[PDB]
Ligand binder design. Structure first.
Ligand SMILES: NC(=O)c1ccc[n+]([C@@H]2O[C@H](COP(=O)([O-])OP(=O)(O)OC[C@H]3O[C@@H](n4cnc5c(N)ncnc54)[C@H](O)[C@@H]3O)[C@@H](O)[C@H]2O)c1
Lengths: 401, 729, 401
């Protein structure tokens, strides 16, 4: 609690799409090493021995992403062998959980300078490749009513009265704001183009974006068909017995995109920044971990946001920018409806519907997205949260410096 | 570490030993204390000695043949012991099935071929013994069945049935086809799915064919002889193991699909079978077998298995043994049956009587309608001939026994009368009175009525001693229960003669004394009325249907309320109101009657009109009526779902005890099987009467906890939940 | 230092051996739930809503151990859906890293009461089942000079002059002290026997222990036969060019045992324990993460121990007990030689050579071992450290309370 945790750098790779994507040929280890080299370029005289850990979120730590990919990034990039390296998995919030853990390690006074972020090469390591204790054990799956995230989003839209046109209207809004952010140059400094071992460009933009999306194009898509396997609808209605039928409104156009990407944030104390000649950009104000019902897994962002607002001593009116991951459109509309979030404050530079949701890295990507927009708008505070599988939730408040 | 139950410090011997000149040991199972071979304590010691001897003489043994001297190969386990297993006996139950399976595992890894000579029914532990063998030959004799039906008793195949069937067929096929529902298979279908390898025509060929297979297996497959596919170096489980990427992509959907087919009912046996199957497929065979043991003990010591073992084993035996049959009555064979009424019921009644081999004279008004009931019985044969079950020799003999007619004098020589004419007492009197003197004086005069008391109907004939109620359920050709109703004038001989008829057609009888609503129609009425009351109180209809499905019923109550006409339930209310008002008492209306009359007021009488609690389109039931929530202001009353469940289950359980107190029923076994087979009471309860002695909730387990929970419901929802004094002290 | 991190409970399962092990039939998820239920038994009135996170280390997070097994433990045990759940992997220190991160989250002030520990069912999920970002990439494996731990251990013995009799003498000491600790009842309260769904006993002791071990029997053992694959000796000697030949002194009797086990520690602030009526057993004085050469992969404890001693302003003389994981005998003798650790202070209750090394759970197992031994001796401080794959190191100093 003593030491304040500051963000000195927050960068990410472009997000390459799932089918015939530019980043499919890139190993996820290389996605992190490139970001490490970008930090070295922005700080040529950085004493890397002062870096005590590298914390990466990764939801499928298997194959290309197994064996502590954070430690592999430390060794492969030639970082000092004392610079740590640890992988963590908290499902969709792993990217933000790594930053929060890095901040909390700084606050404990026992760590000075830490790299935090995530990496998820979903084109190479699909979701569920790591198996799962809940999914593959029938006794746990039977007791804990397991249901995919897509069914929870449809249940939210059904209970809240979110029509297919309502969720598609938000999906159109995300494509527009993501296109406007790239056109205005908002992402020019934080999106680090991925290159090969020869320096040749591989990807410099978020190729999942469909900036010419129309209301007519979204209306012609078809609902999701772990889903498309029998049982999950009846299981959800067994707990939500007052709901008669689930309205399946979510498609590939109003849900987050399967993409590859990585993100890296440099967090340290004020003394670590002054000693290394690093200018602070934002201060980690407070973090929170909570959750809601594990069938409606995506209602977790609401109690996690109230929890972090309580700790920081703030209210909704004190936050200039709200950044919630766009796993599904109904989740964001539910979050906006509950906390009365103004529309011009919510996901102002587009979200995962347009740019993609690289599971282990999305939390650090949208965190650095708010570090840039707070600077560009000359605004003060931002709140970043993500829904989680299993019914969890994580929220973080940052303050521009 | 032992093939025996005790290894410190004198049962029967049930296995003979025959070793021929070629070193083939023939283990012939023959329990001297019964006609059925069973996995009792005597078998465990007998098989424990033989397996000890198989190992000690292995240098002189070339093959093993498992056979049986009884008509059946082997049938089930020791249910009288499993029902007494308390939770603190879990270690004893665990050690018992481990000893049984260590025997089979040694027989399976003997390094020699082992063949099962399946001469008859191989059920439960019987098939598990044959599954331990390397080759299964079965005689295609009639009456023989094979399967693992211990899920029907609340148990699981704990003698290797789960482990071995998963090794043979994979997780998905073994669960769906064999384990989850305990399906019984005729020898031809047992060979089709793979439970049986060879078929022979008679039992005489079995042992010689098994020995011939052993002699042939040793010559052609010497290194693989006596080695199961899963004990080989390159074994690959069908469909893959849980680590396989193809199975892991669909594996998380197995519990959710099972939760769909079970509709959320608290039946723990299928859950444990799926758990033991998947967890077993993750490890070696021996570890998988021990995991199977722990799940087996978890079911045996639970209350749900003690409910099902009481209902589907003990209660069913007591009924089939004649517990409600009058004492000391001889059998009176049936020469020619005569059915008065060719409608939906009389068609099936004439079919199930002809399928059993009885000459049936079917009468109706016109010969047109007299053959429309027979046309019902050709629709079932033309579908049983397409499914390749029966023969054209049997089917042409069946339909020949059904004689359609409109001549009342054609009832000459008819000694059994089953009437299915419409619910009109003057009509039943008319149809009977025009037939009593043409049929024999020795003839039974039965009525299929569901509401009209047998006492009043019997006064239309002279031999009221021969008048009785023979109440089938629709459809007749599938529903197993026959509710035999004893009128005031009904003789014990007539009751026993109909009891013999019910068993002769392959159905299960219960004896009921004459009363309003009898037993089935009366008890199920409290179930549908309890749900309509909840709808009027303001409970969401989707929650009410969810409560009925998660309680274990086959159909939710509002849906069932549409099948039974709402103006039919309203008539039963007016009929019962006149009965109480004529007696002088004041008729207190059930809170559901205001819901019935409100729905009838809106012209939504149910499925026949196409409008009820559900909407209907092209004969297919659509969703729930959207105007239903505005009518009854649903959503304003949100009690816990477990209260809705208990309100329906307790309503029927209390009404069952009232039936027992009033003498409507004679035994608890007739109440349990009557409620299970008759009205669809959830099988996990073991019947509406077992539900009292087996209730389990936060209050506890037993009759007292039932009384406490019933009063907890009574103070919250109405005095109808207050228990009768017979359940108190 | 405003918020201090206190250890209120520290429990573990018995360690079941690799072949014909008692815990092979037990899902690793079930190993954690049993410890969760034990904590409930010791505190029946605990408001589990105050528990904000469950942090489990796991080196092979795949299959039975995939899908965030910490969250799986939360849902399967019936803990509040707000209780978090995150899996992490820092190789052999994952268990101690989870305790450190829990302690650091408490000191940050943004977490109140956290369960921390680890689980590793090595007989069901062997080492390397998760793949590896290094071994899968030949270009990276070729660059970092990957050399397995057992060969780094044999290289330590050759450089430091440790004989086969020397490493076997320490192994005999471990078997004797583990047997004396078990016979003396030291482990009676913290080793929670594993039972099935029927309550039947599965395992109540550390079955990997060989209490009747003799020096003559250890000599008859043969050296270890991945290190059996060729090239690793030549690769190691290319880095350590002054050593002509590696003396392979390590066998299965002087190295850590492959076992199944789980450990769980309850960590919280003083106010959180007072609120729930919890009596503090020890205080986390400091944590540190450092590293050593990545080819030797095992000299990480020495800089990490010095780093945590400097962080707490302490020296070796201030420490009553030293607990270093017995991954290999030469690792411990090297650590003892460098810091001049007295023999009477080093692994006083035996170690992984006798009881086993469940990768993800070991760090939390040996930490609770020192919590009990400080109470039993009425001593003040204990230092706990584990060597890490990739040449990392983690050290923690606890103080009796
Ligand atoms: N429908 C059910 O689900 C159900 C359930 C239980 C009991 N029952 C009882 O079954 C009987 C009705 O049987 P069903 O549903 O097959 O009948 P149904 O509804 O098909 O009735 C029409 C039949 O009545 C016949 N009929 C009318 N007058 C006749 C006469 N004088 N002689 C002979 N036949 C005459 C018609 O010819 C035709 O055979 C009633 O007693 C009813 O209470 C019915």
């Amino acid at each position: 609690m003593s030491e304040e945790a500051f963000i000195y750098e927050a960068i990410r790779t472009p997000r390459g799409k799932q089918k015939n994507g530019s980043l499919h040929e890139v190993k996820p280890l290389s996605l992190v090493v490139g970001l490490i080299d970008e930090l070295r370029k922005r700080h040529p005289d950085l004493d890397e021995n002062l870096i005590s850990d590298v914390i990466l979120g990764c939801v499928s730590p298997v194959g290309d992403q197994g064996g502590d990919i954070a430690r592999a990034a430390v060794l492969a990039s030639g970082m000092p062998v004392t610079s740590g390296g640890v992988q963590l998995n908290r499902f969709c919030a792993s990217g933000l959980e790594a930053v929060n853990t890095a901040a909390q390690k700084v606050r404990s006074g026992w760590d000075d300078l830490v790299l935090a972020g995530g990496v998820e090469s979903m084109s190479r390591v699909p979701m569920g490749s790591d198996g799962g204790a809940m999914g593959l054990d029938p006794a746990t799956n039977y007791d804990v009513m397991f249901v995919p995230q897509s069914i929870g989003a449809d249940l939210i839209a059904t209970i809240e009265g979110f029509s297919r046109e309502d969720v598609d209207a938000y999906a159109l809004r995300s494509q527009q704001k993501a296109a406007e952010a790239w056109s205005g140059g908002y992402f020019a400094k934080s999106v680090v183009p991925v290159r090969d071992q020869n320096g040749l460009l591989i990807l410099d933009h978020d190729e999942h974006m469909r900036p010419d999306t129309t209301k007519e194009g979204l209306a012609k898509l078809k609902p999701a068909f772990l889903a498309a396997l029998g049982g999950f609808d009846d299981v959800a209605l067994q707990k939500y017995h007052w709901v008669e039928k689930i309205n399946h409104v979510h498609t590939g156009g109003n849900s987050s995109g399967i993409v590859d990407g990585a993100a890296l944030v440099m967090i340290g104390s004020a003394a670590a920044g002054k000693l290394q000649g690093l200018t602070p950009r934002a201060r980690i104000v407070a973090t929170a971990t909570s959750g809601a019902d594990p069938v409606i897994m995506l209602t977790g962002p609401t109690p996690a946001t109230r929890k972090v607002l309580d700790r920081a001593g703030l209210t909704v009116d004190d936050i200039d920018l709200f950044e919630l991951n766009e796993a599904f459109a109904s989740v964001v509309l539910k979050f906006q409806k509950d906390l009365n979030i103004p529309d011009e404050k919510l996901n102002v530079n587009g979200g995962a519907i347009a740019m993609g949701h690289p599971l282990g890295a999305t939390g650090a990507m949208i965190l650095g997205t708010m570090v840039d927009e707070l600077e560009r708008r000359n605004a003060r505070r931002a709140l970043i949260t993500l829904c989680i599988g299993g019914g969890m939730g994580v929220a973080t408040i940052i303050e521009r410096v | 570490s032992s093939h025996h139950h005790h290894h410190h410090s004198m049962p029967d011997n049930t296995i003979q030993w025959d070793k021929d000149a070629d070193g083939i040991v023939t283990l012939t199972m023959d329990d001297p204390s019964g006609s059925t071979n069973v996995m009792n304590e005597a078998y465990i010691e007998s098989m424990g000695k033989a397996v000890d001897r198989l190992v000690a003489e292995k240098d002189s043994i070339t093959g093993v043949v498992v056979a049986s001297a009884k008509k059946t190969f082997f049938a089930g386990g020791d249910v009288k012991t499993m029902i007494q297993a308390r939770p603190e006996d879990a270690g004893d139950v665990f050690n018992t099935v481990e000893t049984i399976k260590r025997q089979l595992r040694t027989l399976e890894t003997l390094g020699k071929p082992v063949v099962a000579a399946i001469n008859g029914a191989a059920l439960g532990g019987g098939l598990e013994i044959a599954l331990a063998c390397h080759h299964r030959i079965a005689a295609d004799v009639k009456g023989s069945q094979l399967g693992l039906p211990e899920v029907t008793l609340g148990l699981l195949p704990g003698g290797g049935g789960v482990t071995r069937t998963v090794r043979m067929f994979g997780i998905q096929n073994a669960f769906v086809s064999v384990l989850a529902q305990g399906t019984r298979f005729k020898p031809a279908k047992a060979k089709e799915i793979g439970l049986v390898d060879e078929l022979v025509a008679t039992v005489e060929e079995l042992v010689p064919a098994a020995k011939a297979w052993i002699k042939e297996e040793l010559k052609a497959n010497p290194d693989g002889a006596g080695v199961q596919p899963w004990d080989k170096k390159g074994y690959k489980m069908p469909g893959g193991t849980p680590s396989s990427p193809g199975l892991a992509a669909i594996l998380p959907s197995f519990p959710s699909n099972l939760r769909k087919q079970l509709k959320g009912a608290p039946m723990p046996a299928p859950r444990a079978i799926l758990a033991a199957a998947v967890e077993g497929a993750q490890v070696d065979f021996d570890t998988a077998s021990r995991i199977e043991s722990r799940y087996f003990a978890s079911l045996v010591t639970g209350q749900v298995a003690k409910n099902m073992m009481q209902a589907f084993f003990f209660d069913l035996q007591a009924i089939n043994a004649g517990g409600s049959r009058p004492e000391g009555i001889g059998k009176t064979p049936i020469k020619r049956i005569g059915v008065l009424g060719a409608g939906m019921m009389g068609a099936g009644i004439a079919y199930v009587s002809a399928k059993a081999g009885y000459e049936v004279v079917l009468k109706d008004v016109s010969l047109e309608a007299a053959a429309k009931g027979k046309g019902y019985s050709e629709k079932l044969e033309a579908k049983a001939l397409e499914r390749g079950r029966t023969t054209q020799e049997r089917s042409d003999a069946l339909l020949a026994r059904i004689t359609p007619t409109a001549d009342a004098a054609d009832f000459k020589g008819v000694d059994f009368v089953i009437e299915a004419v419409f619910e009109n007492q003057e009509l039943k009197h008319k149809v009977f009175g025009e037939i009593e003197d043409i049929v024999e004086p020795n003839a039974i005069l039965g009525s299929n009525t569901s509401t009209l008391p047998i006492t009043g109907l019997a006064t239309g004939v002279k031999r009221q001693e021969d008048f009785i109620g023979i109440h089938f359920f629709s459809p007749v050709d599938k529903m197993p229960l026959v509710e035999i109703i004893k009128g005031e004038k009904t003789s014990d001989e007539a009751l026993a003669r109909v009891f013999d008829y019910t068993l002769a057609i392959g159905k299960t009888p219960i004896v009921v004394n004459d009363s309003r609503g009898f037993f089935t129609s009366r008890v199920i009425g409290t179930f549908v009325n309890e749900a309509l009351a909840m709808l009027g109180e303001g409970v969401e209809p989707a929650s009410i249907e969810q409560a009925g499905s998660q309680a274990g019923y086959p159909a939710p109550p509002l849906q069932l309320s549409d099948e039974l006409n709402l103006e039919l339930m309203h008539k039963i209310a007016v009929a019962t109101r006149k009965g109480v008002e004529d007696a002088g008492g004041t008729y207190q209306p059930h809170p559901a009657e205001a819901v019935v009359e409100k729905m009838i007021e809106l012209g939504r009488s149910g499925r026949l009109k196409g409008a009820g609690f559900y909407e209907y389109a092209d004969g297919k039931r659509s969703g729930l009526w959207p105007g239903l929530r505005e009518t009854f202001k649903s959503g304003s009353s949100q009690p816990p779902l477990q209260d809705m469940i208990d309100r329906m289950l307790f309503a029927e359980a209390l009404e069952t005890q009232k039936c027992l107190d009033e003498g409507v029923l004679t035994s608890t076994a007739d109440a349990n099987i009557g409620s299970i087979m008759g009205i669809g009471f959830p099988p996990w309860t073991g019947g509406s009467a077992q539900f009292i002695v087996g209730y389990s909730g936060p209050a506890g387990t037993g009759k007292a906890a039932f009384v406490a929970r019933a009063r907890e419901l009574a103070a919250a929802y109405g005095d109808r939940f207050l228990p009768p004094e017979s359940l108190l002290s």
